[PDB]
Amino acid sequence: MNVIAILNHMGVYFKEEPIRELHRALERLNFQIVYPNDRDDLLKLIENNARLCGVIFDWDKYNLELCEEISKMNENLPLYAFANTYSTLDVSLNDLRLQISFFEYALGAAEDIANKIKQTTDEYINTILPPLTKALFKYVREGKYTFCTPGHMGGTAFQKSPVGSLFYDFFGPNTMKSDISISVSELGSLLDHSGPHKEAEQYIARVFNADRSYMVTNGTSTANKIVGMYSAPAGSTILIDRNCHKSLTHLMMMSDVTPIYFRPTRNAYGILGGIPQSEFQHATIAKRVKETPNATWPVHAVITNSTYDGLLYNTDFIKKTLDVKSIHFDSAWVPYTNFSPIYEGKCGMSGGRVEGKVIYETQSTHKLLAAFSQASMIHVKGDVNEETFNEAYMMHTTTSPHYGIVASTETAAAMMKGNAGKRLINGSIERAIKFRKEIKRLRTESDGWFFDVWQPDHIDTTECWPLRSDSTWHGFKNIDNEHMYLDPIKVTLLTPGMEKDGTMSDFGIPASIVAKYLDEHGIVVEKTGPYNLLFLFSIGIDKTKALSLLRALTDFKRAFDLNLRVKNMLPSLYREDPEFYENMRIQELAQNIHKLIVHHNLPDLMYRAFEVLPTMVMTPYAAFQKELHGMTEEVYLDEMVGRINANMILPYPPGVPLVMPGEMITEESRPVLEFLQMLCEIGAHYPGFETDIHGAYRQADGRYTVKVLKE
Amino acid sequence: MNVIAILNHMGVYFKEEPIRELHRALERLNFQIVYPNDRDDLLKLIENNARLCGVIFDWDKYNLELCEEISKMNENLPLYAFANTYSTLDVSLNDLRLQISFFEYALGAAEDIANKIKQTTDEYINTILPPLTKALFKYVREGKYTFCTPGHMGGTAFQKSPVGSLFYDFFGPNTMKSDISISVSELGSLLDHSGPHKEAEQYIARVFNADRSYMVTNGTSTANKIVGMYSAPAGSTILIDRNCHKSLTHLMMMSDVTPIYFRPTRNAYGILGGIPQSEFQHATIAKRVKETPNATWPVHAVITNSTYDGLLYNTDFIKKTLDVKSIHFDSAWVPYTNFSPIYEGKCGMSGGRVEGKVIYETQSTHKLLAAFSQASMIHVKGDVNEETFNEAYMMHTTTSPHYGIVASTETAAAMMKGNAGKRLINGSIERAIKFRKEIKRLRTESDGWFFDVWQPDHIDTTECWPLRSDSTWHGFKNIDNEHMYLDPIKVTLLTPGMEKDGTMSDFGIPASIVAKYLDEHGIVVEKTGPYNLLFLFSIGIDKTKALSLLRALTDFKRAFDLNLRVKNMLPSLYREDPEFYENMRIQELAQNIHKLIVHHNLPDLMYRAFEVLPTMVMTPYAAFQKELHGMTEEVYLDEMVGRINANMILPYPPGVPLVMPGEMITEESRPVLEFLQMLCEIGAHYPGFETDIHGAYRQADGRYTVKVLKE
Amino acid sequence: MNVIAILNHMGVYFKEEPIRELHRALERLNFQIVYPNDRDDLLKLIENNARLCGVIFDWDKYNLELCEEISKMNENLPLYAFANTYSTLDVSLNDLRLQISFFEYALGAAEDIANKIKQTTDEYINTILPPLTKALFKYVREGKYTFCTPGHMGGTAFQKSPVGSLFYDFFGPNTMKSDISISVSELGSLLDHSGPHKEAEQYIARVFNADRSYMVTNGTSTANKIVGMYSAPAGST
């Protein structure tokens, strides 16, 4: 961060020569001096370059033109105004947050002004840095502790080895030297919540609208288990979303609780909707407590907000309606919801404290914000026992946390702080809406088929678009109004092949082929279902990546319509089986896979498998205890009716869990078995399109086995 | 790694001019050329510099002088021999592992030889790099995936923010770009054990003498919980060392198991010995199963090897003796024991497979090897259910692991691979023994008091020195022979103040004062007990740090004997309380703290508190369930007799747990209470020397509270 | 104070090329490197040059020859010893008060060792400076107070006049910027005996074998009258 912008050409030597001397003096202090041509050039320099740390300008020529715009962009950016005899302060500048230094046009003053600009740049850096990251950077620059832990000791032990020296030269001195422990006492402790760490946590809470914040260094997987072992004692009952992550069923397998499942809705595409409002009502939960054995009233409720395809709930309704004293939102896919007013009422920390309830949010800061991997946050809005929650926190946090991960968590909090965070999140939202409108325009203007967006028919406003019952774009039957909202940055593209009423088309391109093409062109699709692709427009997706995605989609359309060979169009799919894809062309492959999907009637079977539940014979805890005792055996997948499942079965598509551990398939849930058998049959035909069921094992003869409990 | 050594001055132009041309051509390829004067200069260049990647020499002048020595140092180092007409290969070179290229003395051949040296250097780098780290480096240099997770996407989202740009500029491009996920499919998956990751695990096993190896990214805490949740089902019984890390008592709090405790021994210094051999016998364990309620035969045994002060067990005796089908060694402090023959029979992976038993080792690779923090290893020698162990592995591993931590774990395995690892560990051992002998020599040659080493009277051999009953240096009463061994690199220095029979001296310096002085001089002491300091001589401690430690100890001796003021000698202790330490001198402070220790009779109380156990009223699992139900209250520390403890109480000194959750102090274990009260009384006098009992809370009036379960 | 003395010629490249790289790095950090020929040359360099702030030498070749003599000359002088594998500390070094840092003979370590030498030179300067002079120098380098007596305000009013600019260019910037008052609160007050001033007086007492010491800025002429008016009331003899 050493770029100073100098904005003028005066025409008088007594102003211009001091600026040249200042330019030379700032270059001796290792500053890069840039020279914008006018006001708009400077505004684009600031908007495009985050390492600009100062603007030098003539005050009387530019104050009324510059100060309001610069305050709207960067309110901590140091301004170096060069003043005149009759310079004054306008009343328009009183409400502006501005960092202004005043200087004079004098010969020989360049070294003093350069030192003042260097000092002010250091002040700016220390202003925008959060406390723990500031302390860590200071220690790496300054501290000289020895005889510590880690045993590499700033990376010196790496340098005594050749391969260790390659490792050191790859990562650099600052990465090794930031690998420290609590031997460095001026950074405090993560487990003690002391020193800058304590400041860090308070800082994060003030950024994220939370009463309390905890930094987790093993991901939202670990954060969910911390919250769930605090909030669910043994023998209790939890209301849990069936659209749950692997970590929540790991929590149920680890802790002796009785699960009662929220039932999500879905459409013909396999996109999961939300939990119906009737499921949050007291009578439904009381009846479900009565019908399952060994259940008391639920003490803890876990809801995934948003859904994986980007559907936000009305969390105000859940807070006023759901009569559970502990409500936990798995908010790993929406860690940005504090930083836009379009998300108000739709996140878990929105609003204020709910009386008689504690609200938890767990967020993957590394997922859709800028943090190192395994960085996560627990946000608490409500009253917890601080010592019991600290004990639950320490039973899952290591005693030697990675300080880079902690520093990245808090640096993401500092990136989202205030107007800069609002600008970043709004830029993401506007890029996502621009991409959605570009897809619709290219759908109108192209000839033949094109991709669609899963969105309302009019997206002409910047908001979370509500899912209304009178519209049929979402495909959900009898949805509640003022219930679900579409997140603008979770763009779901739809490939041809299904009609709006859930009926298959004659022409169709399965989305796996489009995903394969995009992976040939270096584009990773987050989620692929049979006719849809998910694209997350986070703060890492700039305009060039959106343009690249749009260009690759048009390239897929032209290459499909030209009917290229699979060998030249999908070379890695060709390398999957060269003697299979030697003479096949892309339209033949698309027609064949689409008619396999239509023949086996995949969307109806996928609907009916997930609209019924297997019977919970025992809890996941008891099933995992039986598995720990070795009482498991593999049976063939056709033979799993009436058998208690030991592992969780999660098919692809739709990617959400289908059978819990301890659950059994009966005649009332035979569509579960039929959908599994259909996936195993439909994946056998074409190489590169194999069956993907986590929890089922392909055998040598092509049959599939599940693992059940011995009887 | 671009340093080529050129070793000669010939005296003939037809040899010397091609070498000058080669020097110029290698400098155009960004190689640093060094010029050793003779053979020993080159040997010291290789021993001191790990980035040397090639030696250019005349073959006939230097083969018999160089090849054996270079093969004993670096078996992969590329040798560039320039050959003559009658050059030949001696029979001495047949058994040597050498990487030799042969070249000719010709004009104008410099570019071709420089390209061959560049190619051979790249081959050397790819030879010594392990597979996953190689794949990660290749992806960072080459890959161009977009629309991925993490959301910073190689650090681009960092660069859009000013504070994020400061973060990016601190860590660098390679650290951000190594933060990837399973979207990058050519590195495989950690949870699937696929791709290079699988190769990684196999690689690690071959380095660490294990049948199976698992990389853990949340530390040995998480590794212990993985192993203990696999090996201890609910309602089972575990034999567990009372000298346990708090991750193991977190495991007992999280799992419904019944603990039976191994009882360690200790001496007057508070150093813990090992578990006696009689404790591993079948009759003792059968009687202990009978005397505690709800216990079957133990299914799992956890033993901390080595102890925290560095005492290794005879693990062969434990493997042949302890009749438990699952034995787990908490080996976080000895991850280097495969790489020296002095550790054979003393680590958990030593020897071969034990029939009917599975041996686990959990190692903190970041602690005493060169890895990033939270890197840990599970080593399995025996038969496990791979699917059940994989399930228990995924219940504690995040779905988005940090790839830098995984790469550092395997890079530490590659650093320890073969003769390079043997040389690093032997260098550590020899530096530690050199330091021990230096302390003894300076003790002999100084006038007045000096520091001692806790070691045998003769350390004249490089081995793990056995603790024998006829010697009295260790202070353990009635120790078993061929049972315990002193680790040479865990140096325990002893300050004056206690006699060898456990009786206090008249003159005494408490080790807290010496630790404070060393922390003033930038030296961190790993463990401090009342008259002893622990220093770990790992691979990160080189000769300059050992010299600095020795010089700081002699400086403490002279500054103590000169009787300097606390204000000038311990400035941070002065800043703890300036009006208290204004006129106090260091000998007065040492005399006062030593006579407080002698008055309260701290070593005898600390012995008697830990030679008795509180009665286990309930398991730690049940105590934590009671705490999760809110059934806890704070009572004063004098009132905790007959009350069931909710938290673990861990005092300092000795730093090992004193009271478990669920345990109760009775009249038979009143010395536990007396030692706690003595610590709370003795810490009230001098600022900077306060009471440190984790699990007890200092109140406003100076009294201490514990948290017990309500009755 | 930026003169580092390097004392050797070893004849082995692995010890000598790191020293050349260190010499280049220290010259990048604005240090003047001098090269004494032997031990006596180094002793005369130390005795004749007060701006020498560090000695770089090989430990095994020179510890017994250098440490006692350098301790008898300058007890705070930073010594930069480069250790070998079998380097050790002699018992004759125990009573010596020495500032020794230990370094290794490695290629590419020059920038880090140069940064350590720069930090150690800063520590040495902070050690030998007294507290109020340290605070005054820190304020002149760092402080940015405004609207404060004296009216020239660090020499600001001087540069607005031609003869004032002659005065400023004669005495220099640090002479003006040190002309401050009690509006700078982190320097303390002379009349209140507060802050570094109090430390200063205590410091002077320790140096001058006095129970109490006072600083007079108007000479012994004024000091005599302070003492006499305290000690002689009216009508006394």
Curated annotation (Swiss-Prot), chains A, B:
Q: Which GO terms describe its biological process?
A: lysine catabolic process
Q: What does this protein do?
A: Inducible lysine decarboxylase that catalyzes the proton-dependent decarboxylation of L-lysine to produce the polyamine cadaverine and carbon dioxide. Plays a role in pH homeostasis by consuming protons and neutralizing the acidic by-products of carbohydrate fermentation.
Principal subcellular localisation of the protein: cytoplasm
Entry EC no(s): 4.1.1.18
Q: Which residues carry this modification: N6-(pyridoxal phosphate)lysine?
A: K367
Protein name as it appears in the record: Inducible lysine decarboxylase
What does the subunit section of this Swiss-Prot or TrEMBL entry state? Homodecamer; built of five dimers associated in a 5-fold symmetrical double-ring. Interacts (via C-terminus) with RavA.
Q: Where in the cell is it found?
A: Cytoplasm
Q: How is its activity regulated?
A: Inhibited by ppGpp, also known as the alarmone.
Please provide the record's keywords in A-Z order.
Cytoplasm, Decarboxylase, Lyase, Pyridoxal phosphate
Q: Which InterPro entries match?
A: OKR_de-COase_N, Orn/lys/arg_de-COase, Orn/Lys/Arg_deCO2ase_major_dom, Prn/Lys/Arg_de-COase_C, Prn/Lys/Arg_de-COase_C_sf, PyrdxlP-dep_Trfase, PyrdxlP-dep_Trfase_major, PyrdxlP-dep_Trfase_small
Can you list the GO cellular component terms from the UniProt entry?
cytoplasm
Q: Which CDD domains match?
A: Orn_deC_like (cd00615)
The recorded induction information for this protein reads: Part of the cadB-cadA operon, which is under the control of the Pcad promoter. Expression is regulated by CadC. Induction occurs under conditions of low pH with excess lysine and anaerobiosis. The global regulator Lrp also has a positive effect on the expression of the cadBA operon when cells are exposed to moderate acidic stress in the presence of lysine. Repressed by H-NS under non-inducing conditions.
PANTHER family this protein is in? BIODEGRADATIVE ARGININE DECARBOXYLASE, CONSTITUTIVE ORNITHINE DECARBOXYLASE
Q: Which reaction is this enzyme known to catalyze?
A: L-lysine + H(+) = cadaverine + CO2
- What GO molecular function terms would the record report? guanosine tetraphosphate binding; identical protein binding; lysine decarboxylase activity
Instruction: Write down the required cofactor(s).
Output: pyridoxal 5'-phosphate
Q: What family classification does the UniProt entry report for this protein?
A: Belongs to the Orn/Lys/Arg decarboxylase class-I family.
Q: From which domain of life does this come?
A: Bacteria
Q: Could you tell me the gene encoding this protein?
A: cadA
Quote the Pfam families the UniProt record gives.
OKR_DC_1 (PF01276), OKR_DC_1_C (PF03711), OKR_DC_1_N (PF03709)
Would the keyword Plastid be found if you checked this record's keyword annotation? Answer: no
Native source species = Escherichia coli (strain K12)
